[PDB]
Design a protein around this ligand. Structure first.
Ligand SMILES: N[C@@H](CCCC[NH3+])C(=O)O
Ligand SMILES: N[C@@H](CCCC[NH3+])C(=O)O
Ligand SMILES: [Mg+2]
Ligand SMILES: [Mg+2]
Ligand SMILES: [Mg+2]
Lengths: 296, 296
């Protein structure tokens, strides 16, 4: 299969006066490229896909594709939906507008059965000829793609190449790669990036890398070379910020940190997301002081 | 506060060749009216709100309003979204098209904080002048509206009048009505309708009533009349069907049962929902045989 692996960033979506700040977005993507990131993920969970319109989802993908041209950096477009017809539409748009692949979250809220998840992803995969990465995040979606369903989809659909796991379940990571070692297991949980990579995972789709792209890139590339001492050292150093960036629901802490770092102009969300509490604002600020944050 | 309480049905949405079967929908609502139901809820979770378009969500509300006009039966329109701007748009449409109130699910997938939930629902409640019922279902949304947030919304916003609880947590039900006895607590979990009503809950928004509207409305009316012996008797009789209707994710079993009863023409869902397993299909059919199912 064709694949998108390595160190990848779930891009935040900056707003100004309620609209997508398109210049800021392109600028933030350039900063990721310049700090060793292998791929960017526009409009995932961290990018507030829920509150963007379909048009804005499409715009953000286009900005990422245009910004990455002439570089090695890939665009793994956020194209998921809890409605299969919507997910197919977003997948097709991403393919026709030059994305290298798509990330497709398990349907949220309507809790499909494993049979329904299989048919959902089969319909998406049959609709494009670019790579598709599954994305399991049960704490947000209310459902879990089982190991059996992931393995069946990987084996049955030529362009489904692996899964982004955000489930805090290293037993499942062992189960996946022990029964199907050819898939690309991708960490979607920054605190346990190193354990996932050391069991044979082949990349990360990171929140922390919005702020510290050089550290996440270094961690991943050390691990892929089996330089596990160095990769573990960075993973350990990053633990405190990796956890504080979830002191409130992602992306509230990461946007707060990007604002505190001067990397975005305004600390704006779309409702129902909003600014953190004053106490957590202070906690985020305090933890940031322990890390060197690259500018532009 | 203006309120919508009593026995209410979370209407299934029948499909024919992939489209909303509008004549079937109207026929199903008339059947609810004939069997003592006090209000209907178009396009809630049970109505496959996730896979309807915004236009179909609006069409179903219109059909409900029109079918109920000139009867005692109210329309509590499903108008929720995980994006506040979408939720406000749906609320306004329901108001302008004659719904008696709206049901508004807590944002799913993006996990707002309690502050965010307060601002979400305050924005919705300020956009219309009809009653708003909150809706807590953490197993599907990934978030919980806390008791403190519900009570503040009830006290601070004139039209927020209560909450549909689908959380399996009778302790929270006690907490809510012990600290704010003026709110309308509505059962969103059929198996425990009687315990919620016996603690001072004032209605149900039912899945089972799609199939057995006479039994659910009787249960509710016995309880509101303080005949706890008879309300409990019906709740107990209904336990087996109340549980089997969740052997797979709702509304997969209830649509299967409606098809098996001859009340809808075809067993059609929109992906990612799909037909149940053959084993669960047989289980639903077996349990249904023990109940008397009203026709048209
Ligand atoms: N709020 C809806 C629509 C989002 C459309 C853009 N990603 C959802 O989360 O599915
Ligand atoms: N699938 C999206 C859009 C639904 C629009 C109609 N209710 C969601 O679940 O939020
Ligand atoms: Mg197979
Ligand atoms: Mg900015
Ligand atoms: Mg009545």
């Amino acid at each position: 299969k064709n694949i998108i692996i390595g160190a990848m960033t779930a891009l935040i979506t900056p707003f100004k006066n309620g609209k997508v700040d398109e210049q800021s977005y392109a600028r933030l993507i350039k900063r990721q490229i310049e700090n060793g990131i292998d791929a960017v993920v526009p409009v995932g969970t961290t990018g507030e896909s829920a509150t963007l319109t379909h048009e804005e989802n499409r715009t953000c993908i286009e900005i990422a594709v245009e910004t990455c041209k002439g570089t090695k950096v890939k665009v793994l477009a956020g194209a998921g939906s809890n409605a299969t017809h919507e997910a197919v539409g977003l997948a097709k748009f991403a393919k026709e507008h030059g994305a290298d692949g798509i990330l497709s979250v398990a349907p949220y809220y309507n809790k499909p059965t494993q049979q329904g998840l299989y048919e959902h992803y089969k319909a998406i995969a049959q609709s494009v000829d670019i790579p598709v990465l599954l994305y399991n995040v049960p704490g947000r979606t209310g459902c879990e793609i089982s190991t059996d369903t992931i393995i069946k989809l990987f084996r049955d659909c030529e362009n489904i190449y692996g899964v982004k796991e955000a489930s805090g379940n290293i037993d499942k990571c062992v189960d996946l790669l022990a029964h199907e070692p050819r898939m690309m297991l991708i960490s979607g949980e920054d605190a346990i990036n190193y354990p996932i990579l050391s069991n044979g995972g082949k990349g990360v789709i990171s929140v922390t890398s919005n702020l510290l792209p050089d550290m996440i890139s270094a961690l991943t590339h050390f691990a892929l070379d089996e330089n596990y001492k160095e990769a573990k050292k960075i993973n350990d150093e990053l633990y405190n910020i990796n956890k504080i960036l979830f002191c409130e629901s992602n992306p509230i802490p990461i946007k707060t940190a990007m604002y505190l770092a001067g990397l975005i102009e305004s600390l704006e969300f779309r409702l129902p997301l909003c600014s953190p509490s004053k106490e957590n604002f202070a906690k985020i600020e305090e933890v940031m002081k322990k890390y060197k944050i690259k500018g532009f």
